[PDB]
Design an enzyme around this catalytic site. Structure first.
Site, mmCIF file in Angstrom:
data_model
loop_
_atom_site.group_PDB
_atom_site.id
_atom_site.type_symbol
_atom_site.label_atom_id
_atom_site.label_comp_id
_atom_site.label_asym_id
_atom_site.label_seq_id
_atom_site.Cartn_x
_atom_site.Cartn_y
_atom_site.Cartn_z
ATOM 1 N N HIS A 45 0.812 -1.197 0.000
ATOM 2 C CA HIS A 45 0.000 0.000 0.000
ATOM 3 C C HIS A 45 0.852 1.257 0.000
ATOM 4 O O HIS A 45 0.381 2.300 -0.435
ATOM 5 C CB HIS A 45 -1.027 -0.013 1.146
ATOM 6 C CG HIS A 45 -0.505 0.397 2.477
ATOM 7 N ND1 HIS A 45 -0.206 -0.488 3.495
ATOM 8 C CD2 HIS A 45 -0.261 1.636 2.982
ATOM 9 C CE1 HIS A 45 0.195 0.183 4.554
ATOM 10 N NE2 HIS A 45 0.171 1.472 4.272
ATOM 11 N N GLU A 59 19.684 6.172 8.007
ATOM 12 C CA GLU A 59 18.976 7.362 8.467
ATOM 13 C C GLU A 59 18.645 7.232 9.947
ATOM 14 O O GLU A 59 18.292 6.157 10.419
ATOM 15 C CB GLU A 59 17.729 7.569 7.618
ATOM 16 C CG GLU A 59 16.932 8.837 7.867
ATOM 17 C CD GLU A 59 17.813 10.136 7.828
ATOM 18 O OE1 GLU A 59 17.595 11.078 7.094
ATOM 19 O OE2 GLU A 59 18.696 10.267 8.667
ATOM 20 N N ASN A 61 17.792 10.795 11.897
ATOM 21 C CA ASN A 61 17.021 12.011 12.087
ATOM 22 C C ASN A 61 16.616 12.514 10.709
ATOM 23 O O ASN A 61 17.463 12.885 9.934
ATOM 24 C CB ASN A 61 17.857 13.043 12.835
ATOM 25 C CG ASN A 61 17.031 14.215 13.277
ATOM 26 O OD1 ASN A 61 16.167 14.692 12.545
ATOM 27 N ND2 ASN A 61 17.300 14.715 14.471
ATOM 28 N N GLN A 64 17.925 16.298 10.141
ATOM 29 C CA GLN A 64 19.317 16.689 10.379
ATOM 30 C C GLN A 64 20.264 15.727 9.663
ATOM 31 O O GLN A 64 19.974 14.559 9.477
ATOM 32 C CB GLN A 64 19.644 16.619 11.861
ATOM 33 C CG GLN A 64 18.881 17.569 12.726
ATOM 34 C CD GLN A 64 19.230 17.362 14.182
ATOM 35 O OE1 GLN A 64 20.187 16.637 14.507
ATOM 36 N NE2 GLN A 64 18.433 17.952 15.069
ATOM 37 N N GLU A 69 23.945 8.650 6.124
ATOM 38 C CA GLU A 69 22.914 8.321 5.163
ATOM 39 C C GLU A 69 23.497 7.919 3.805
ATOM 40 O O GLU A 69 24.479 8.497 3.366
ATOM 41 C CB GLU A 69 21.993 9.522 4.947
ATOM 42 C CG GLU A 69 21.291 10.093 6.199
ATOM 43 C CD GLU A 69 22.045 11.229 6.897
ATOM 44 O OE1 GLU A 69 23.296 11.245 6.871
ATOM 45 O OE2 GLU A 69 21.362 12.086 7.511
ATOM 46 N N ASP A 93 -0.158 -7.550 1.683
ATOM 47 C CA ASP A 93 0.358 -6.168 1.748
ATOM 48 C C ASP A 93 1.882 -6.209 1.842
ATOM 49 O O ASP A 93 2.469 -6.017 2.918
ATOM 50 C CB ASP A 93 -0.287 -5.392 2.871
ATOM 51 C CG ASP A 93 -0.068 -3.880 2.773
ATOM 52 O OD1 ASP A 93 -0.465 -3.170 3.740
ATOM 53 O OD2 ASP A 93 0.486 -3.445 1.750
ATOM 54 N N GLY A 186 2.810 6.521 8.587
ATOM 55 C CA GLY A 186 4.211 6.743 8.361
ATOM 56 C C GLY A 186 5.105 5.612 8.825
ATOM 57 O O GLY A 186 6.284 5.598 8.450
ATOM 58 N N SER A 188 4.037 2.435 8.262
ATOM 59 C CA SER A 188 3.697 1.383 7.300
ATOM 60 C C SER A 188 4.889 0.974 6.513
ATOM 61 O O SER A 188 5.695 1.817 6.118
ATOM 62 C CB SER A 188 2.649 1.873 6.332
ATOM 63 O OG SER A 188 1.406 2.031 6.969
ATOM 64 N N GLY A 189 4.985 -0.321 6.244
ATOM 65 C CA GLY A 189 6.057 -0.854 5.460
ATOM 66 C C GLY A 189 7.283 -1.210 6.243
ATOM 67 O O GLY A 189 8.109 -1.975 5.740
HETATM 68 NA NA NA Z 1 19.330 12.495 8.596
#
Ligand code: NA
Length: 240
Positions: A45, A59, A61, A64, A69, A93, A186, A188-189
């Site tokens: 979804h 990741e 933050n 910031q 990353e 799903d 947010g 989800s997944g």
């Molecule tokens: Na960051």
């Protein structure tokens, strides 16, 4: 994640942020789990919309520079062929994303380990949900990665009438439902990490919560059960 705590930055190195291009910037939309250097597992979804997506690994933050990353475009999306976007309760799903480049592994970027096919957790098994999702029902995204302790709720209980009834299937895992801690929009997944024989494995892909709110007593967060999809996952990766 409602009722979470900030994660340590090297606790959950398979967690990714799935983001979409929004004007001149990028916005977090979903979580996911890195399962190969060039493949991510997420919810179907999450990729229903026709957006430009990227994955961020390493990741912590969203607001910031963490110094860790790696940013990578999504090259191919393979949704489960039985997924039906207007019937999330039917299940299926799950989606796999092939990344445009292979990411580099380090203490912030590692593959998620998956359970053995068919594994079902006993009731009340210890798990953590992780994500950057809303921190309250109708709230806002977290800045820093959150974790919440959500013990499992077995099928017999979860599918009872005061819980989810018919909406929960055996191809799902339920966790939480205490009214304080939950997944939220947010998340989800993203992963549900469960500690089994000393080792965390990703047993769930966050799928849905109650339309009445995130942290609702007797409406545990519902996840796709990863152990039901091992062959599907292997078949997709081997044919792409
Ligand atoms: Na960051």
């Amino acid at each position: 994640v409602v009722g979470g705590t900030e994660a340590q930055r090297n606790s959950w190195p398979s967690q990714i942020s799935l983001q979409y291009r929004s004007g001149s910037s990028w916005a977090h939309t979903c979580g996911g789990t890195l399962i190969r250097q060039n493949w991510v597992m997420t919810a179907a979804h999450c990729v229903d919309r026709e957006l430009t997506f990227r994955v961020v690994v390493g990741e912590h933050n969203l607001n910031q520079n963490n110094g860790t990353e790696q940013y990578v475009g999504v090259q191919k999306i393979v949704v489960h062929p039985y997924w039906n976007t207007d019937d999330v309760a039917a299940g299926y799903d799950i989606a796999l994303l092939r990344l445009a480049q292979s990411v580099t592994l380090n203490s912030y970027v590692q593959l998620g380990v998956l359970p053995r096919a068919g594994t079902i957790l006993a009731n009340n098994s210890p798990c953590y949900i992780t994500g950057w999702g809303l921190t309250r029902t109708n709230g806002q995204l977290a800045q820093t990665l959150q974790q919440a302790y959500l013990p499992t709720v077995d099928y017999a209980i979860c599918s009872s009438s005061s819980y989810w009834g018919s909406t929960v299937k055996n191809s799902m895992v339920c966790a939480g439902g205490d009214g304080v801690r939950s997944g939220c929009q947010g998340d989800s997944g993203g992963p549900l990490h469960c500690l089994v024989n000393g080792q965390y494995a990703v047993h769930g892909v966050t799928s849905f919560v109650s339309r009445l709110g995130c942290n609702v007593t007797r409406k545990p967060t519902v996840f796709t059960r990863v152990s039901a999809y091992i062959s599907w996952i292997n078949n997709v990766i081997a044919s792409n």
